[PDB]
Design a protein around this ligand. Structure first.
Ligand code: DND
Ligand code: ONL
Ligand code: ONL
Ligand code: ONL
Lengths: 657, 339, 340
């Protein structure tokens, strides 16, 4: 029923940070630039346009700010901006020196559809080094009440909130340059109070190192406040009597850079981006210490004044001004991925090391199939042993054939290798149980499969008892998610699971990383390389199910939200980025029908079927910021629930193709 | 004047330590802590910050609620306190402690034979892999005092520790998640006059989490014109569900001063000389810092100030600081090119 | 003049504590059960129907409470039950996890005749032993103002009172499970402020002796507060991953049990009872120290928001859902009489 292709309908809000052409001392001209940039924002369906500090006057005009004609010109340019915004869709936030009581205030006028919503004075006026703001301007910290603008008294002060009434996840707070540089920023309290989108208007003359400073503090604010941060600085046109301007603009969301514009531009620039208000909602919803902090400053936070406006955003397809990656567990940026891998690996190793220290260095029993997972776990187990000064021959690896890679790796590593043929025991069990296969019937059902799976595990566990060892778990996060494993006796069961927290899509990249580090050597490298090259299509592509895993595990997003995201990430193979190690051939695209089909399978398997196998999970380290699936940790759920509501949301909300 | 004395030039030698945790065994944690504090003492350091719940192990879950665990924590604490009589640095050591109805996630500040104060963690994460509110009480809003082996020492989140013989050294302590909330305890402490912010962390390691620690510890220090001293738990913490990297780091006004190896084998210390005069000078010049204090006057004037005397070394103990030859010309090539 | 045979005209108010069938993670199914039980309360001429904690979602679902589709479905089911209450007599009190500001709260939604009257957050969230509530849910104590439920700002908080303008002896306070277990329960203060009927929605997984703990505290609450105490625990349908559920319901009045239902029922159960509002009026009129305690906690008892609604209860003969002893001075129970 929703327009599935509408970003507004998926909880996005389009925000724009703008740097305009300053004509200092000339508000009619600054207004005219602002208006032209506002119309481009409207055209883009943006709900917010933040301009630089003192937009209407020029930031750098010094005592020209005290000139009657300057002040008067400003006021008339504003009233004209307001009249024009009648037919503009975005909330406009626009700097202006304004008269109130005894002084001029460095203010931000929040404008929307033909009416001022509020005027926000700069709380904090730098009067040091190259800044002289206390000379011409009065602090706004702790002023309240109203201000008369064009025949209307409108909220004036630093405790204002602009809550969109048709967009409950968009609640705007405004501050101004130095406001965000002090230990206790205005916007920190406003996030506790309920602001989701934090605007900052800057003049910010540019200096060596200062752009890093802007970034450090706008980014960490967005992270610590679980907010978007929208930041605009002055550029061309400001006075160069003592200073220069770079016109930097940027948008942050929860510590991530959504957009940024060119530094030192010829001409005006914008950062436009889609902010995910559900990501912010979900993060707040889960970090209760955020609410604990609000209740600690209840007086501060409850004092805020909330101004409403109907945003009435466009209903149609307007694209997604957002970078949605194909692999939420696998960053496309190669130095970021190198970092994840370093960390994944060391997490797995140190987790297991502690298990081994704690048990006075047991032997290490591991089933090696030549697959990616067991291959990787062997490597992890080898490094653990090295670091602890234990002989590699204390790793007891077992090939367990049922009805080359493993053996080569085992020998290259120098671990104790052995083959145990489970065939005769499988045969005897299938007969004892009266399975049709024991009388010739080619019935290859779950029992047939499980009898083997189970016996592998049964054997390893008995070896472990007999030989003073522990069985290493091999199953990865994606398997835990789907219940693609054999419960209890089999697969799912071990003394310690190193891959438990690692999703399937990340596994190959870990091996790549192991080869690259080169620490094991030429032959080991070669065998590992070989394992990658030699190496379930009814649970779907793991690339799709890991995409779904991240949205549910981190954010709890509804299914139609996940389809939207996956479709945007995976729809066109030629668009967006791929991590290292995907040859052009190895680069699939997925249709909406494909994405929808496998998501139906995900919700059913994840929410309903698989919890019970997750519920009795061996020990192992959590790996990913995306979460892990331990029932003692990240994922607490019933083993006895239907996924009806998720499947119903897909029927109603996600188009069939 | 001793020209070659870092202390006489307004420096304070600060240390962030990651010890070897023996979970559920306080006496052994105190042994690892005491060993590392003597190393710090030898280095002429004035502060040693250890990880969250140092004396118990952070990761022991309901073992925290076991009586023998708490008795042993207290006996170990009292012995640590006894041993510092001879130790130059102020020790900041985590412990689960009984006060009133519950146990608190505390940092105990220890100097020269006495406890100076006890600081409860303010915000207790109870989400994802964190379960802290199950065993432990929030420290936010708590004041008054606490009985530690025959003395009533200050207890609460509003404490400053000032070196009467070294005024640029003013210490505030917060614990792990305390630095991740919109309005950290430590932001208010800086306005009240804290120049050195300690953070004891447990902080199970996850992909990306060091970047997060970094961002908030660096941005804290820059926003608050302070040194920020961070110490996380490492080897020995339970790996039932989690992994530990024992990261320690020292920031100053946005700059990184020192940091230690991640996932070390064995104990590690970051040690660095903090320029209290740097901090002093930035504070002096940035008036809007003090404007912010005055806006939160009642918040910032209520802090309690505990005095101690450091009596630091008079002599030449080198300088644990990278002083660039060209303040105007970064030696780092990437940075120089950016400049 | 008066219809002599009308319990309402004699200052009685009919109340139901209900235990419904849970379908964990399925609010439309929970709502259909609720609506059906509410229709039976209406047919009984009940003024009030209390359902178990988190009625709409299921109490036992843990992190599923944090799912957008869980919360959205909860909201939609809730709106339909409010639309369906247009034709129902009783105030319904149904549990639901609802978003407010940063988090979800464990709430009771007080519903009457096509509108929501108020939304009461659980005050104290057990985070110990088998309970994990602070992980998913925010505490409700100290929270005021309002919440937007389907295009309407309705009172929100632990300071709320639902007073019948046409039945002045019926003044309702709602609290949730653990709220009655703490040294200073929210219902205690609400009694001093005027509440005469105290509702408790519970999840309360069952354990050896726990029904005895519920009784101890519901009973003594009703006696110490000179009030009716209406209590519903969760039942069949709830997750048995780690817990079991007994579906216990009970109605107390000044220390005396009015009604209680079968434990571990197969199917839905109710306690329905006529509460004597004049009996409560009478005990309060006479025990001045009750009012002395109110004036001692004057600031605390005077800030409750009173929310009015008209009941229009039935005027005719609907019998009397109450034990009336032939000999008030001679208890018909042998063990009780022997003691007397
Ligand atoms: N909620 C619940 N609570 C308690 N018990 C529950 C239950 N739901 C099912 N069960 C029981 O558990 C059993 C079903 O679970 P399980 O024994 O795992 O059996 P099941 O999950 O039905 O099948 C396992 C399948 O996963 C695939 N697999 C397994 C292992 C390795 C690989 C590989 O590619 O390497 C693939 C393979 O296709 C295999 O047949 C049944 O006995 C069922 O009655
Ligand atoms: C506009 C502004 O306040 C920038 C000055 C700030 N303190 C800085 O960049 O250091
Ligand atoms: C404690 C700390 O500084 C980092 C880890 C923290 N618990 C988190 O990232 O949530
Ligand atoms: C009503 C409830 O939250 C369970 C009972 C309570 N936790 C208790 O203390 O028994």
């Amino acid at each position: 029923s929703m327009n599935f292709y509408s970003a507004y309908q998926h909880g996005f809000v389009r925000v724009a940070a703008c740097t305009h052409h300053t004509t200092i001392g000339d508000p009619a001209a600054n207004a005219a630039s602002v208006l032209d940039m506002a119309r481009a924002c409207h055209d883009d369906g943006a709900a917010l346009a933040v301009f630089p500090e003192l937009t209407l006057s020029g930031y750098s005009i010094e005592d020209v700010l005290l000139q009657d004609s300057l002040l008067d010109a400003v006021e008339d340019a504003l009233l004209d901006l307001v009249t024009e915004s009648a037919d503009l869709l975005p909330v406009l936030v626009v700097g202006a020196p304004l008269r109130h009581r005894h002084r001029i205030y460095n203010t931000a006028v929040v404008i929307h559809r033909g009416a001022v919503l509020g005027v926000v004075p700069k709380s904090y006026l730098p009067t040091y080094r190259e800044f002289y703001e206390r000379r011409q301007m009065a602090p706004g910290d702790g002023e309240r009440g109203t201000i008369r603008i064009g025949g209307a008294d409108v909220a004036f002060g630093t405790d204002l909130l602009f809550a969109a009434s048709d967009l409950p996840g968009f609640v705007l707070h405004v501050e101004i340059c130095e406001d965000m540089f002090v230990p206790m920023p205005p916007s920190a309290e406003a996030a506790l109070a309920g602001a989701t989108v934090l605007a900052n208007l800057s003049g910010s003359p540019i200096t060596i190192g200062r752009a890093e400073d802007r970034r450090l503090l706008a980014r960490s604010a967005s992270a610590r406040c679980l907010a978007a941060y929208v930041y605009a600085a002055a550029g061309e046109g400001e006075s160069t009597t003592d200073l220069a301007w770079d016109g930097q603009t940027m948008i942050w969301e929860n510590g991530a850079l959504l957009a940024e514009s060119e530094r030192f531009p010829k001409g005006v620039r914008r950062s436009v981006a889609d902010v995910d208000t559900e990501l912010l909602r979900s993060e707040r919803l889960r970090m209760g210490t955020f609410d604990d902090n609000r209740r600690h400053h209840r007086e501060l936070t409850e004092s805020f004044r909330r101004i409403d406006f109907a945003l009435d955003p466009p209903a149609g397809d307007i694209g997604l001004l957002r970078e949605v990656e194909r692999f939420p567990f696998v960053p496309a940026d190669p130095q970021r991925l190198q970092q994840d891998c370093y960390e994944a690996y060391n997490i797995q190793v140190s987790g297991l090391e502690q298990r081994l220290r704690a048990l006075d260095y047991p032997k290490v029993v591991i089933g090696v199939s030549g697959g990616l997972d067991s291959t990787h776990a062997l490597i992890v187990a080898t490094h653990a042993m090295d670091r602890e000064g234990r002989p590699r021959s204390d790793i007891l690896a077992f090939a367990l054939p049922g009805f080359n890679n493993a053996i080569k790796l085992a020998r290259a590593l120098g671990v104790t290798f052995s083959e145990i043929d489970i065939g005769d025991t499988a045969r005897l069990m299938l007969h004892t149980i009266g399975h049709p296969y024991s009388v010739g019937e080619k019935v290859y059902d779950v029992t047939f499969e499980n009898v083997q799976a189970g016996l592998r595990t049964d054997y390893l566990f008995r070896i472990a008892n007999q030989r003073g060892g522990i069985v290493l778990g091999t199953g990865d996060l994606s398997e835990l998610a789907l219940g693609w494993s054999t419960y209890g006796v089999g697969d799912q069961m071990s003394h310690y699971n190193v891959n438990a927290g690692v999703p399937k899509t990340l596994i190959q990249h870990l091996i790549r990383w192991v080869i690259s580090a080169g620490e094991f050597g030429e032959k080991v490298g070669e065998v590992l390389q070989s394992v990658l090259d030699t190496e379930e299509a009814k649970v779907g592509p793991f690339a799709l199910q890991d995409f779904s895993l991240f949205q549910v595990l981190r954010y709890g997003f509804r299914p139609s939200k996940i389809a939207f995201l996956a479709w945007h990430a995976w729809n066109d193979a030629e668009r967006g980025n791929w991590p290292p190690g995907f040859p052009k051939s190895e680069r699939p695209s997925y249709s909406l029908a494909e994405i929808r089909h496998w998501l139906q399978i995900f919700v059913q398997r994840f929410y309903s079927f698989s919890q019970f196998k997750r519920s009795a999970l061996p020990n192992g380290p959590k790996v990913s910021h995306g979460g892990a699936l331990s029932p003692r940790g990240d994922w607490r759920a019933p083993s006895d629930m239907s996924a009806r509501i998720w499947l119903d949301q897909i029927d109603r909300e996600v188009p069939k193709g």
